[PDB]
Amino acid sequence: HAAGLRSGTRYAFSRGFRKHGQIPLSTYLRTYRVGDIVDIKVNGAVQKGMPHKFYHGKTGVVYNVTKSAVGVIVYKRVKHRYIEKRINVRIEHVKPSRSREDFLRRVKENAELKKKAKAEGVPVQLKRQPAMPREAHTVSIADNKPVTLAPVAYETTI
Amino acid sequence: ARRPARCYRYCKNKPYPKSRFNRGVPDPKIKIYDLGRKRATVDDFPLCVHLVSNEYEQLSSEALEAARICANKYLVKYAGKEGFHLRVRAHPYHVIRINKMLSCAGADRLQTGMRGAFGKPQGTVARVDIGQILISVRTRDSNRAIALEALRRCQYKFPGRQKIIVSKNWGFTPLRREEYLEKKAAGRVRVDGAYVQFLTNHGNLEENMRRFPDAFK
Amino acid sequence: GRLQEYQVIGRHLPTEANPNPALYRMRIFAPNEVVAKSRFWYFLRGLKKVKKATGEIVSVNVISEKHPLKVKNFGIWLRYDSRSGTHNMYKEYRETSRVAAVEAMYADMAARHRARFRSIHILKVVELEKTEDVKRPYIKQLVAKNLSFPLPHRVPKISTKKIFSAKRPSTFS
RNA sequence: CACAGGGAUAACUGGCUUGUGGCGGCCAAGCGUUCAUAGCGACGUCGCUUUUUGAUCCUUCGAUGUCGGCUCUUCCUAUCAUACCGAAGCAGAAUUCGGUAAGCGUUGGAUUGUUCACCCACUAAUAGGGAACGUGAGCUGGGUUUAGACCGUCGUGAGACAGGUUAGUUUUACCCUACUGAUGAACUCGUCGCAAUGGUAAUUCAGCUUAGUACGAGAGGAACCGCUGAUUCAGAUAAUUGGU
RNA sequence: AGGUGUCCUAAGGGGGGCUCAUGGAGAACAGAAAUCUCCAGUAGAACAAAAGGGUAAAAGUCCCCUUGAUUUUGAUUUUCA
RNA sequence: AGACUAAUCGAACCAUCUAGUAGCUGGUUACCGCCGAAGUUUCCCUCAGGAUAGCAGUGUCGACCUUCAGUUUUAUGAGGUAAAGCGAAUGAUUAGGGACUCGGGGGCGAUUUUUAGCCUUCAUCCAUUCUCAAACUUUAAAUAUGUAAGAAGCCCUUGUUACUUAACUGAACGUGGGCAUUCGAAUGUAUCGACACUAGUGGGCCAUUUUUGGUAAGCAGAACUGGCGAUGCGGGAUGAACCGAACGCGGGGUUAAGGUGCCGGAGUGGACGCUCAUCAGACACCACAAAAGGCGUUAGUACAUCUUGACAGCAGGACGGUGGCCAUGGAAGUCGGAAUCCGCUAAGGACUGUGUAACAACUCACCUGCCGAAUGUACUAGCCCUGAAAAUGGAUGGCGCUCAAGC
């Protein structure tokens, strides 16, 4: 029984199948600013500035920007309390997250719906709501007549 | 001095095949798996009968080989050495262990009791499931009664419960009798040694028309 | 229980690639119109790729007997589970209504084969049209010409709280 | 050799398990001159019991006296003999396989502390087991297992050895219950009776005749009835014999 | 099922050219195997060591130059109070 | 002899140090009310013990801030288990076929054989085929898991810098203004945040599901959750862990698990069937029984036969070539080997048994005479039976129960 820095990371830090060799260069052209929402995903082919196996899959907030790395804040759960960890990760392991993208899209339409509606003169009904039960309707049997079913007898297939 | 078969009947451990980790396992008792005219064509023996299991247990290699002999004896005597083909379709790959006590409970050195009780290999055994097939026999249409009795007599050497089912296919092929009959008449069938191959209309024309000349007329 | 025959109509939810799906009709014996729908979904899940979360229920109606004061012979085709496999069955009954036949069949199977309600499928029920297509002997005896039979040794009924009778009863009633 | 503690932890009974030990089945390649099942049974497989030995440590360490033998009662059947029967490669005789059956028996000695064992001899037979591995306020103390002492191997030494040998204190019942017997108040004192319930008892062999017969080529060689005795056990008695 | 109490002035650092194991076909002694040539060859070779991950105009291989194996203190990660 | 030295000796007796130390046994004194646990993480010559964190009590303070949540919805990330796969890589593994001879071996054509000859047995390629992987994989669930759902928000203009850019081009922090009429999913808020001081505990055990060693165990060791310990009450006759349900003192009403022939409060209640046991059976955890058999009885599946007269019963026949070929002391159907034809038919086997040294003789298969209608065979699963042997007398709780008071 041992506990090393990469214990039990046989399948996590591996690259996929038929994904080996060159790293797509579009990774190095993104830009980050403090307050952005990023998520960590480690790449096995780069051994410098890589995070411990616990943060592989978590999501955090950038708080510092450096030459080739960013500082991220994430929340760890020790027994009966949370702690905030500050880790340094190279940009090859990070990616911008689409978690808040839906929120930003929705707020823009909400503003403009409210503006347009105020000029016209009809209430808004802007905030969303869950899926309500269906409503009544009619179904015709013209050119679609029902077919009668029945359970089937038993028989051996092999 | 093998232990009674009551002692290894339920699947209680993960599979344990022989590999570069456990070395020194005794060779399985059964080695032969095919008997009879194991080179007959598919058109000679159109009747197939199977012996299917009905529980989730373990069958030992020793038991399998003993059952094999019984079926062979009966068929040869009443149907002839040249009238059937029998195949056993269950291979033992699971290794069962044993912990030797009294012989390992010596005065000199070592430890007596339940201290460090990982065992040593002791034999092999086969895992079966519900609906799995154990023994198959193909023969002519006039050996129905002979085939049925052979398997019925064979089953008395296995623990548990098994059934006998007369199949609806042609020989050992996964085709029903009517479908195989009419498809062969169409000509998309090529005879091979003891088996057949089928047409697929996805290759290239030159090679396909050589192999299956009768499909194009 | 106390059963009744329902017709149940169901459908797959319409979609953009397939509006107006097909309609499936079944006849189901059930005590009320709640287990009626459940039995429908159970039988449909085994024939076609439709759930209930992705389907809907079109209609549910009650079928009543057409002549509940006429006696008729029935034949039933069914399948059931034993403790060691599955089998097919065919039995016959003599009464005045289809619903009772299902009532009688359930009691008979549970008694003679220890088959609960969980494991029985009703393939088909049909009333025998003529008299010459009756097969089982325990009903052929009941359609003989000029039937008549006495009833010997029938106990009389006495109040279960009238203890200490004063004379010997008699069974020749 | 000592102290404080531990059933948180071993050596014996008891409890769960049954590998090993013991006992019984199912299929049938074959043995049996020919013939699978008179009598057996390979290769496989399903069980039962707690009189062998293991595994665990649940109960007792302010203590349940720890080998064997002697005496005594009762219980189980997986039946050695005794009663009556069914099968055979059962002519007779001698035998082998099975059933109903635990009522009645199952020995005397040489060697060893022995449990275990092996010889001599009689007998119808000399079957297997339990009861806190029955039984120490019932006995004995041959062995193990305190202190004395000798030898051999080991250790420089004190000392060690499930290696051999010799000598070594065995305590208390008047209490409660159980058992064997003996009195006894109440309805006046007596004599003669009935019988609910509880207990229960007999056992085996030998000689004569059947008979040199049935059976069998011969060698050999039975049985019921009848008659007279004897072994083990039980209840009494003292004229004769013996003991005191 | 196995491994550690070591080893390295290069087996560290930078730059540059090349591609491997193996198979097919040929060439005096030469052959099963010595050296040379063409074609195919997704890593089936190599990377000090146990096993896993990673690497192809390289992280392998050959060539050129060096000592970031240097000075001053702080922040953060895994085992974790 | 570790013997004796005042009943004391493997180190006498008397007083003092001395109330000598103990991580170890034993005890620890009136009532009511409110709250209410742990046997777990890290370190210790630590394992019968301590410190540390956790669980708990009391005292408060900041607002009554309106924030929160062992939960759901919507949007968006990570995983390599169950399953599946091997005519897909690695590894294991059964069998034929085609192509090849100079890869090996055994023959033949003159073993000629250094003949690309005829055979073939391995081996090698190609298209197929029967089974597997806790330390294999191209794929890939269910259950659980990270983040977000705004006023501390969104948009517009332009001030600061010793940083950065060729550069007022950027980055952070800002001034000013605009956008609420509706602050931007559901439900709840019978309980919001912070601080101080300290008690006990640090031997645990049981259960569904997942699961490791072991033949197995009322055995040893783990994960999520629920219990006993620390807890009474109704049911399982009895029993810490099971089912129902958690508790101030009383009166009335209704139920849960469980029951209604008596013991025992309430049906000898109703409908359809199955079972006769010279060992019946009788309610989850639970106090046990299997493989294999039955012409006991009930229900079902399939196939075959039949007024051109079946199954059963009684009665008749049961022929020739031909004692077929070999085999050998002799074997004429009947020790054994290999063949398996015809004649006459109403019918008869180069044979089913008994039998002889061999014959003979008997019988069977097959057909026919009599009768007057439906049978014959092989399988499936319900209750019952055989399989079923232990020690004081005995336990479906007891008595008892048979169109049940059993299933």
Ligand SMILES: [Mg+2]
């Ligand atoms: Mg004589």
